[PDB]
Symmetry: C4
Subunit: 245 residues, 4 copies
């Protein structure tokens, strides 16, 4: 079946909606909820978060669902089983702290040839795929055959929204393209799936062919008084989770 | 099949016995044996104890069985796989120290949606279900469909008995309602089971409908010269178990 | 099928051979090879050694087999998964250091009720079964139905041989009955097997009925120039095994 | 089916090619690529590397494949699950750092009798088989029935090539026969396979019968401007792998 995978680059705001497939699931990641409109609707099949902020993102996502801003069926942590990248205890105890979520690596590792591809480039050449590509690998492992890409701009404005929000900055004060492109080519060739681009003005469209025009319609709902920053758990909550950070 | 789940609140002494089901199993917990009469009989299907006193409670239970005060088929430890709540070595080595007992979490975790529900409230909001509710989740995991509740009073006298006994005080010198009520509602709705209340005068009866009057009979046997305090193992026994405390 | 289980008490020298069963396997333990005659033949189905001397006993057994003194099909370590009794790394790495041997606990633990029985008495009352009884439990787990006992004397001369040998003393300078008797009664009743005694003059014969007289014959071969002390591995070998001691 | 197993001794240069089997797979190890000609072709079924240099050898092998110098289907690490021989974290995390490779021990250990044979000699007598013999055991575990040996000379010039290369010396400045011979005899007798020698002038041919002359042909391709030293990863790569070295 068919999936739309969305990064959070500026092209998220410039999807050509006549090229949307007839039916589909949606994958989102990281600060997706910062978007000022529902560019791909409220309903997610899966959302993906990095280990470094998973504790805060899970808490924030439960707020989004309760407040009827989004829904999702799956919740994934984008990990790799690498000591230099992730806390060992966090991975070991994951299913006991977050019983309705999944370690993304449990799916990523089912693609042996791609896992090998990723590890060689990360360890020896310091070349790492982004979340956009990570989500593609997980979709392929779950059985999707046609993947439609949006919001992937290779960092050239940084984002489809203003990302410099108070709480996020408190947690992460920090707030090439070859790596992602070669990885997508490998996935397509190795696993016999099809990639499409939904964003004609994106740099991605230079490398990946456009989804065909099907005269599809889509209503873009605007958002108001919405959650536009990550939420920060209590000091007692951090105390309980402190081995895993 | 049918189960009666008993906490140790004052309502344990005020069961309406005409509402007992036609056939049933009984679950008890913690200091249940402090009761001055056999309010639910001598025969237990399962008994539940917290990790913090399991070593002493297991020793005490073997005395109760040998002395013909109670019998039980199952022995459960009420754990959650949470580092802030339980000793890691205790859980790791449990089946080798207590081969005829079970970790309650081995059953609790089979209810994925409830495990997620519990963990979110405990970790982020410092809201924890009590043993009464824990036993309900385990019963549901074991296949019970009709659950009859007693001895659940939400701590307002503290107990159906005087709990301030010498040994217990030596081990634990320490000797809201929304959390338990919302959790029971979730269990009932999610797993399609039925909850009943056996205690008409209890606060519980404001939230959970009464078991129907079936004109049942029950003989309440009085107790004499009985074990009414926890027993304390030898210093040599503590020495052997010291990694797990 | 039928098994003869032998301890190393003085009664090993006073078997009534007319009571030997028509066909059988033999279990031996610890310093059995110190015997001055082949009281039960050269062929063992299994030999059992304690964790504390396993490293040296395994080395010694390979010498016995090469020198054509004994043979055995199985090699067992008599462990319990108890931190106060055995080195944790020794158990964890056992199958990689001794690939043709077994941890006895892998069989012992298949008898859940007896494992529980043993652990309760050891941990809380400092009452421990001996190797003789351990071997019985393992035989029952392996499917034996009729067990014939010898060399079990409850330590009242200590042994059927002089145990005060140079190397053994170097490794272990140290070189009641109720516990073993109650444990054997439990095994017999719980698992529905039959116990017999082969040694009419033993204290054991006061508690366990004699094997029936079948007019069987047995040739007792004498031993000469034989291995009558444990062997000590090189200092380099100890260096390699030092985490496990 | 049929396999040629090659060590890197001087006899690698003196194969009698009329004795090559009609069809076959090839196993190579360690510094095989230092060879000045393709003595057994470019195509390997498997290549084997020691834990001590695996990090650098894997990196080097990926270069060889990209540069079209060799190909291989399998990549094996020649380990034994022994603390004195290999880094514990290296083994624990192996499949996550090298997803397209295998721990050789996962196959070696399938030969229980040989694993026991190896461990006894290594631990107690400081007698260790070489990589040549290790590869034979792995071939047998994978189902091969006829094994053809080359490049096994028992270290008497050291090698079929000059091994004193700059990078290798930087990583390993260090750059009897009874053990290997008795181990090969054990493998042959125990697992019912056939061993042949391809090198008539080798010391091996004194102990193992020659492969029959089949009038086979083989073209020995010369090598030019080829990789003749191990490659050294960046300091950043070592930083990431530092727990495993
Ligand atoms: C991108 C980079 O290398 N940044 C360097 C910093 O490294 C980051 O350090 C963090 C410390 O908690 C985390 O370990 C980051 O690791 C993750 C993460 O964010 O959790 C691991 C994820 O698996 C990975 N996600 C994917 C899909 O690959 C993310 C991801 O790469 C992004 O967050 C990167 O923007 O990273 C880890 O990247 C740090 O060493 C500083 C030095 O102090 O240098 C930065 O250059
Ligand atoms: C209730 C509470 O938070 N009390 C606080 C103390 O926390 C207790 O500390 C104990 C130290 O050994 C245990 O870790 C207690 O944890 C358990 C337990 O009793 O073993 C874990 C059980 O899984 C849990 N049982 C259930 C069914 O949820 C029990 C249970 O919640 C009751 O025993 C609570 O009455 O707790 C742990 O609760 C401690 O931090 C002191 C500070 O020193 O503050 C108390 O407020
Ligand atoms: C018998 C006793 O309690 N002796 C006390 C000593 O305890 C011994 O300490 C040893 C130190 O390496 C071992 O841990 C002994 O544990 C075993 C063993 O010999 O390996 C564990 C075995 O599972 C057990 N075998 C069986 C079949 O039960 C043996 C066995 O009980 C006999 O070896 C006992 O004679 O023990 C452990 O028993 C030690 O604490 C000294 C104090 O320094 O006090 C002794 O009383
Ligand atoms: C051969 C020997 O005993 N050399 C002694 C040194 O021991 C070497 O130390 C290394 C330190 O990183 C490694 O642990 C070597 O272990 C392996 C290896 O090279 O990785 C383990 C492999 O499984 C083994 N391979 C096979 C197929 O058996 C190799 C192999 O034996 C060869 O590399 C040996 O030439 O060894 C380990 O052997 C070291 O203790 C020095 C003292 O400082 O003394 C040397 O005699
Ligand atoms: N300018 C951008 C911002 C994000 N992306 C993609 O969106 C994904 C989510 O953004 P982030 O920076 O939070 O990882 C990111 O991993 C890339 O796949 C991009 O391609 N170009
Ligand atoms: N006053 C009371 C005392 C106990 N209970 C219940 O009885 C259970 C056992 O009592 P305890 O305090 O030992 O956990 C407790 O977990 C609650 O479920 C109660 O509801 N009200
Ligand atoms: N005097 C003795 C000596 C040994 N035994 C038995 O022989 C077994 C082996 O002797 P040992 O002391 O090495 O554990 C021992 O465990 C007992 O089961 C005995 O019963 N009486
Ligand atoms: N002179 C030699 C060199 C190597 N070998 C064999 O070649 C194998 C690979 O060589 P190496 O030294 O890297 O382990 C080695 O393990 C032996 O099996 C040999 O037999 N004689």
């Amino acid at each position: 079946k068919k999936v739309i995978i969305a990064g959070n680059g500026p092209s998220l705001k410039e999807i050509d909606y006549s090229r949307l497939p007839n039916d589909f699931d949606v994958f989102r990641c990281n600060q997706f909820y910062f978007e000022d409109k529902y560019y791909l609707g409220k309903k997610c099949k899966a959302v993906f978060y990095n280990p470094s902020l998973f504790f805060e993102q899970y808490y924030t996502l439960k707020h989004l669902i309760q407040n009827q801003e989004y829904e999702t069926e799956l919740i994934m942590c984008s990990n790799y089983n690498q000591a230099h990248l992730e806390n060992e205890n966090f991975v070991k105890t994951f299913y006991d702290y977050f019983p309705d979520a999944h370690l993304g690596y449990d799916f990523f590792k089912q693609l042996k040839d791609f896992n090998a591809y990723f590890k060689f480039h990360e360890i020896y050449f310091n070349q790492r795929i982004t979340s956009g590509v990570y989500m593609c690998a997980v979709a392929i492992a779950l059985g999707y055959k046609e993947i439609y890409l949006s919001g992937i701009d290779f960092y050239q404005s940084s984002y489809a929204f203003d990302t410099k929000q108070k709480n996020l900055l408190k947690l992460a004060p920090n707030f090439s393209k070859n790596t992602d492109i070669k990885a997508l080519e490998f996935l397509e060739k190795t696993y016999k799936i099809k990639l499409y681009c939904l964003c004609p003005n994106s740099l991605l469209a230079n490398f990946i062919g456009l989804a065909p025009n099907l005269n599809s319609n889509f209503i873009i709902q605007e958002k108001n008084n919405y959650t536009k920053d990550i939420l920060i758990p209590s000091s007692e909550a951090y105390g309980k989770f402190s081995k895993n950070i």
